[PDB]
């Protein structure tokens, strides 16, 4: 239920008055849902091939206790702070579950 607009050109909820309608569902909203089968397949492959030289470096830094240095290493390799934070979280989970 979108917020009804006022009748004027300025302020909060400005604009011409109509009867707004809610957004229709789409097939594009299936993205952002969990992918259980895709996740299970990735787990099988990750078990088979193991770790990588980049992940071993992050493993050692986390073991010592240099979390900030681990993020700096990941950010340089992956080029994005969001990508770097996801990589560090994944290695932390794997070490805990091992």
């Amino acid at each position: 239920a979108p917020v009804p607009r006022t009748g004027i050109i300025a302020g909060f909820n400005k604009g011409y008055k109509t009867t707004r309608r809610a957004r229709r569902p789409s097939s594009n909203d299936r993205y952002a849902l969990p992918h259980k089968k895709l996740r299970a397949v990735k787990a099988i492959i990750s078990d088979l091939v193991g770790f990588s030289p980049m992940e071993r470096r992050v493993q050692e830094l986390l073991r010592v206790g240099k979390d900030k240095r681990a993020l700096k290493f990941c950010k340089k390799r992956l080029g994005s702070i969001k990508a770097a934070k996801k990589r560090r979280a994944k290695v932390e989970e794997a070490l805990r579950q091992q």
């Binding site: 990735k42 492959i45 091939v49 193991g50 770790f51």
Partner: protein, 203 residues
């Protein structure tokens, strides 16, 4: 299905097992010719993704190209004119190596039609791509509604005109909207549109 496991395995090119397999293959490729015909593709899942089918009339080749930048072919490294045009080693070609591999196969075997290509391997001095081609005179190709469009004469040597996926990449056709306004039909067509002098009858 089995596609997912093959697809996810090829997303781990940095693992120990994948690096071992690629290292042995690269050594084998180093001792072959520049162009080699294959009975079956080495990445069947990737080949089918870009338009390969296990049927008569489809062929696969492996093509080798040399890595590095381009060197201007000027005698003794002497350029003339303004100093803005100097430089012999630091300039780069304006088309990618994926499309150079396709054009080399196309110009060599003129009775085939190039369809697509994909990445296979690399080393310190060489790059390897696999190219999918179709024979347009075969009965099975000409009677297949999904592929017989390539028989028409307007698709001759489509890789030399930059109409493949790799050719579209360096033309800027992966972009739309405000990021591609000056090259959208083509770079030349946009320039002609913006630079011709217009004379209306009653101005």
């Amino acid at each position: 299905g089995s596609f997912m496991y093959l697809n996810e395995l090829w997303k781990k090119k940095s693992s120990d097992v994948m690096r071992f397999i690629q290292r042995v293959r690269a050594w084998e490729f180093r001792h072959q010719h520049t162009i080699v015909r294959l009975r079956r593709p080495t990445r069947p899942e990737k080949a089918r993704m870009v338009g390969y089918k296990t049927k008569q009339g489809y062929v696969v080749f492996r093509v080798r190209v040399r890595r590095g930048g381009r060197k201007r072919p000027v005698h003794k490294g002497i350029t003339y004119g303004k100093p803005n045009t100097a430089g012999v080693l630091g300039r780069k070609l304006n088309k990618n190596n994926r499309v150079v591999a396709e054009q080399r196969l196309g110009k060599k075997y003129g009775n085939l039609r190039v369809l697509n290509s994909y990445w296979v391997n690399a080393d310190s001095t060489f790059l390897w791509y696999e190219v999918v081609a179709v024979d347009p005179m075969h009965r099975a190709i000409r009677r297949d509604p999904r592929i017989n469009w390539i028989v028409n004469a307007v698709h001759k040597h489509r890789e030399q005109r930059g109409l493949t996926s790799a050719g579209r990449k360096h033309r800027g056709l992966r972009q739309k909207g405000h990021k591609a306004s000056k090259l959208r039909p083509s770079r030349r067509a946009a320039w002609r549109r913006n630079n011709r002098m217009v004379f209306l009858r009653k101005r």
